[PDB]
Amino acid sequence: PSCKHCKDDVNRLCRVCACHLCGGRQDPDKQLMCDECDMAFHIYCLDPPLSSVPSEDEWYCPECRN
Amino acid sequence: ARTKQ
Ligand SMILES: [Cl-]
Ligand SMILES: [Cl-]
Ligand SMILES: [Zn+2]
Ligand SMILES: [Zn+2]
Ligand SMILES: [Zn+2]
Ligand SMILES: [Zn+2]
C-alpha cells in the first residue's frame, strides 16, 4: 500500500494522499501540490478558491505559507 | 504551480 491511511481505496476519501481539504481524488489537473509539505489541494477547495491554476512557479498551501 | 496532473 502506497498510502497507509486509506490503503489506496479509490472509494475512500483521503486527505493524506488526495485533496488535503476534501479528500477527493478527482481533477488531479486542478490539484495544486504544496512546494513545502507536498500535500494536494483542489483549486476549488481553497479559500478563496481559484478559477484556474496559478502560472507562478512556487505555490505554498494555506498551512505552509506566510 | 505544480499540479498532481
Ligand atoms: Cl486517515
Ligand atoms: Cl498537515
Ligand atoms: Zn490515502
Ligand atoms: Zn478538494
Ligand atoms: Zn503545505
Ligand atoms: Zn493539514
Short mmCIF file of N, CA and C and ligand atoms in Angstrom, two decimals:
data_model
loop_
_atom_site.label_atom_id
_atom_site.label_comp_id
_atom_site.label_asym_id
_atom_site.label_seq_id
_atom_site.Cartn_x
_atom_site.Cartn_y
_atom_site.Cartn_z
N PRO A 1 0.82 -1.21 0.00
CA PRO A 1 0.00 0.00 0.00
C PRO A 1 0.85 1.26 0.00
N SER A 2 0.68 2.11 -1.01
CA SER A 2 1.38 3.38 -1.06
C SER A 2 0.96 4.23 0.14
N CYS A 3 -0.34 4.35 0.35
CA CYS A 3 -0.86 5.14 1.47
C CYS A 3 -1.49 4.29 2.57
N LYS A 4 -0.90 4.34 3.76
CA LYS A 4 -1.37 3.54 4.89
C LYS A 4 -2.68 4.07 5.47
N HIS A 5 -2.99 5.33 5.20
CA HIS A 5 -4.17 5.95 5.79
C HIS A 5 -5.43 5.42 5.12
N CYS A 6 -5.43 5.36 3.79
CA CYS A 6 -6.60 4.86 3.04
C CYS A 6 -6.38 3.53 2.33
N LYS A 7 -5.18 2.97 2.44
CA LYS A 7 -4.84 1.71 1.78
C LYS A 7 -5.18 1.76 0.28
N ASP A 8 -5.03 2.95 -0.30
CA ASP A 8 -5.25 3.16 -1.73
C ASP A 8 -6.64 2.75 -2.22
N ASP A 9 -7.64 2.84 -1.34
CA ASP A 9 -9.02 2.56 -1.73
C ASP A 9 -9.61 3.78 -2.45
N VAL A 10 -9.88 3.66 -3.75
CA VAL A 10 -10.35 4.83 -4.51
C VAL A 10 -11.72 5.35 -4.10
N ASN A 11 -12.51 4.52 -3.42
CA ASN A 11 -13.83 4.96 -2.98
C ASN A 11 -13.77 5.54 -1.57
N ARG A 12 -12.56 5.68 -1.06
CA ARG A 12 -12.35 6.25 0.26
C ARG A 12 -11.80 7.64 0.08
N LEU A 13 -12.37 8.61 0.81
CA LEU A 13 -11.78 9.94 0.91
C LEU A 13 -10.44 9.80 1.60
N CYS A 14 -9.47 10.59 1.18
CA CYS A 14 -8.20 10.62 1.90
C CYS A 14 -7.54 11.97 1.80
N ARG A 15 -7.42 12.64 2.94
CA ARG A 15 -6.82 13.95 2.97
C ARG A 15 -5.30 13.86 3.00
N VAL A 16 -4.78 12.64 3.08
CA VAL A 16 -3.33 12.44 3.08
C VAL A 16 -2.75 12.29 1.67
N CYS A 17 -3.34 11.42 0.87
CA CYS A 17 -2.85 11.21 -0.49
C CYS A 17 -3.73 11.81 -1.59
N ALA A 18 -4.86 12.41 -1.22
CA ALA A 18 -5.67 13.16 -2.18
C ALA A 18 -5.82 14.59 -1.69
N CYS A 19 -6.85 15.28 -2.15
CA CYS A 19 -7.02 16.68 -1.74
C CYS A 19 -7.04 16.78 -0.23
N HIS A 20 -6.16 17.62 0.29
CA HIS A 20 -5.97 17.72 1.73
C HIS A 20 -7.17 18.36 2.44
N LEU A 21 -8.00 19.06 1.68
CA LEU A 21 -9.17 19.74 2.22
C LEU A 21 -10.42 18.88 2.13
N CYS A 22 -10.65 18.25 0.98
CA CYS A 22 -11.88 17.47 0.85
C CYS A 22 -11.66 15.96 0.79
N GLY A 23 -10.42 15.55 0.59
CA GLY A 23 -10.09 14.13 0.50
C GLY A 23 -10.42 13.51 -0.85
N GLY A 24 -10.83 14.34 -1.82
CA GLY A 24 -11.24 13.81 -3.12
C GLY A 24 -10.08 13.60 -4.06
N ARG A 25 -10.17 12.60 -4.94
CA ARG A 25 -9.10 12.25 -5.86
C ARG A 25 -9.32 12.77 -7.26
N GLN A 26 -10.51 13.33 -7.51
CA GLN A 26 -10.88 13.78 -8.85
C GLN A 26 -10.08 15.03 -9.26
N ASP A 27 -10.05 15.31 -10.56
CA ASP A 27 -9.39 16.52 -11.07
C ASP A 27 -7.95 16.71 -10.60
N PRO A 28 -7.08 15.71 -10.82
CA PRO A 28 -5.68 15.88 -10.41
C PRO A 28 -5.01 17.04 -11.16
N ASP A 29 -5.56 17.39 -12.32
CA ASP A 29 -5.09 18.53 -13.11
C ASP A 29 -5.39 19.86 -12.40
N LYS A 30 -6.29 19.82 -11.42
CA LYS A 30 -6.64 21.01 -10.67
C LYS A 30 -6.20 20.90 -9.21
N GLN A 31 -5.37 19.92 -8.90
CA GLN A 31 -4.85 19.80 -7.55
C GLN A 31 -3.46 20.38 -7.49
N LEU A 32 -3.32 21.49 -6.77
CA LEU A 32 -2.02 22.12 -6.54
C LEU A 32 -1.22 21.34 -5.49
N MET A 33 0.06 21.10 -5.78
CA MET A 33 0.94 20.45 -4.82
C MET A 33 1.75 21.52 -4.09
N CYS A 34 1.69 21.50 -2.77
CA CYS A 34 2.40 22.47 -1.97
C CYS A 34 3.90 22.26 -2.08
N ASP A 35 4.61 23.33 -2.39
CA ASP A 35 6.05 23.26 -2.58
C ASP A 35 6.79 23.06 -1.26
N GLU A 36 6.07 23.15 -0.14
CA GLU A 36 6.67 22.83 1.15
C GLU A 36 6.30 21.44 1.69
N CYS A 37 5.01 21.17 1.89
CA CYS A 37 4.60 19.91 2.52
C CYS A 37 4.22 18.83 1.51
N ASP A 38 4.03 19.23 0.26
CA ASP A 38 3.69 18.31 -0.82
C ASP A 38 2.30 17.71 -0.67
N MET A 39 1.44 18.35 0.10
CA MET A 39 0.03 17.96 0.10
C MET A 39 -0.64 18.56 -1.14
N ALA A 40 -1.77 17.97 -1.54
CA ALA A 40 -2.52 18.39 -2.73
C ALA A 40 -3.75 19.18 -2.31
N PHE A 41 -4.15 20.13 -3.14
CA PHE A 41 -5.30 20.99 -2.84
C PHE A 41 -6.04 21.32 -4.13
N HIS A 42 -7.30 20.92 -4.26
CA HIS A 42 -8.09 21.36 -5.41
C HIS A 42 -8.10 22.89 -5.39
N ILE A 43 -7.94 23.52 -6.56
CA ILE A 43 -8.07 24.99 -6.60
C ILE A 43 -9.43 25.42 -6.09
N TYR A 44 -10.45 24.62 -6.34
CA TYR A 44 -11.79 24.99 -5.93
C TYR A 44 -12.12 24.69 -4.46
N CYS A 45 -11.19 24.04 -3.75
CA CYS A 45 -11.38 23.78 -2.32
C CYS A 45 -10.67 24.83 -1.48
N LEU A 46 -9.74 25.55 -2.08
CA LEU A 46 -9.05 26.63 -1.38
C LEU A 46 -10.03 27.73 -0.97
N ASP A 47 -9.63 28.53 0.01
CA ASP A 47 -10.41 29.69 0.44
C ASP A 47 -9.48 30.90 0.51
N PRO A 48 -9.53 31.79 -0.50
CA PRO A 48 -10.52 31.75 -1.57
C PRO A 48 -10.17 30.73 -2.63
N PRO A 49 -11.20 30.22 -3.31
CA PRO A 49 -10.99 29.26 -4.40
C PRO A 49 -10.49 29.95 -5.65
N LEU A 50 -9.59 29.29 -6.36
CA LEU A 50 -9.02 29.84 -7.59
C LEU A 50 -9.76 29.28 -8.80
N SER A 51 -10.04 30.15 -9.76
CA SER A 51 -10.68 29.76 -11.03
C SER A 51 -9.78 28.98 -11.93
N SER A 52 -8.48 29.15 -11.76
CA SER A 52 -7.55 28.39 -12.55
C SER A 52 -6.25 28.19 -11.78
N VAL A 53 -5.41 27.32 -12.31
CA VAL A 53 -4.14 27.01 -11.69
C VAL A 53 -3.19 28.19 -11.86
N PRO A 54 -2.59 28.66 -10.76
CA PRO A 54 -1.70 29.82 -10.89
C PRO A 54 -0.55 29.52 -11.84
N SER A 55 -0.10 30.53 -12.56
CA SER A 55 1.01 30.37 -13.50
C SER A 55 2.34 30.53 -12.78
N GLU A 56 2.31 31.19 -11.63
CA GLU A 56 3.52 31.38 -10.86
C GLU A 56 4.09 30.03 -10.45
N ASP A 57 5.41 29.93 -10.44
CA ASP A 57 6.08 28.64 -10.29
C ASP A 57 5.96 28.06 -8.88
N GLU A 58 6.24 28.87 -7.87
CA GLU A 58 6.15 28.39 -6.49
C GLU A 58 4.74 28.58 -5.94
N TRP A 59 4.23 27.55 -5.26
CA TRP A 59 2.94 27.67 -4.58
C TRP A 59 3.03 26.96 -3.23
N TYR A 60 2.68 27.68 -2.17
CA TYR A 60 2.65 27.14 -0.82
C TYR A 60 1.22 27.19 -0.32
N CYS A 61 0.80 26.13 0.37
CA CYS A 61 -0.59 26.00 0.81
C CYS A 61 -0.90 26.88 2.01
N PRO A 62 -2.19 27.03 2.34
CA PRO A 62 -2.64 27.83 3.49
C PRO A 62 -1.88 27.49 4.77
N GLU A 63 -1.43 26.24 4.88
CA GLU A 63 -0.73 25.76 6.07
C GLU A 63 0.76 26.11 6.09
N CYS A 64 1.40 26.12 4.92
CA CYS A 64 2.85 26.30 4.87
C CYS A 64 3.30 27.72 4.53
N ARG A 65 2.37 28.56 4.10
CA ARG A 65 2.70 29.90 3.65
C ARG A 65 2.82 30.95 4.77
N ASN A 66 3.06 32.20 4.36
CA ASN A 66 3.34 33.33 5.27
C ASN A 66 4.80 33.34 5.69
N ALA B 1 2.32 26.83 -11.00
CA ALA B 1 2.30 25.94 -9.86
C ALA B 1 2.30 24.48 -10.31
N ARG B 2 2.84 23.61 -9.46
CA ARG B 2 2.84 22.17 -9.72
C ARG B 2 1.45 21.58 -9.40
N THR B 3 0.94 20.74 -10.29
CA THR B 3 -0.31 20.02 -10.03
C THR B 3 -0.05 18.52 -9.91
N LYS B 4 -0.98 17.77 -9.37
CA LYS B 4 -0.83 16.34 -9.35
C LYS B 4 -0.83 15.77 -10.76
N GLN B 5 -1.65 16.35 -11.62
CA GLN B 5 -1.69 16.38 -13.11
C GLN B 5 -2.38 15.33 -13.95
CL CL C 1 -6.76 8.58 7.90
CL CL C 2 -0.94 18.59 7.77
ZN ZN C 3 -4.59 7.86 1.19
ZN ZN C 4 -10.65 19.16 -2.65
ZN ZN C 5 1.89 22.99 2.57
ZN ZN C 6 -3.13 19.84 7.28
#
